[PDB]
Amino acid sequence: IINVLTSIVTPIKNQLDKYQ
């Protein structure tokens, strides 16, 4: 679950990174 939750955060955080 934790690595999976982090697997969900991965794209979102990088999406933000790309957005910023």
Curated annotation (Swiss-Prot):
Signal peptide as annotated in the record: none
Domain of life: Bacteria
Cystine residue pairs: none
Stated role: Promotes colloidosmotic lysis by binding to the midgut epithelial cells of mosquitos. Active on Aedes aegypti.
Note, other: Toxic segment of the protein is located in the N-terminus.
Family designation: Belongs to the delta endotoxin family.
Name of this chain's protein: Pesticidal crystal protein Cry10Aa
Species this protein is from: Bacillus thuringiensis subsp. israelensis
Top-level taxonomy: Bacteria, Bacillati, Bacillota, Bacilli, Bacillales
Interval of the full protein contained in this chain: 134 to 153 of 675
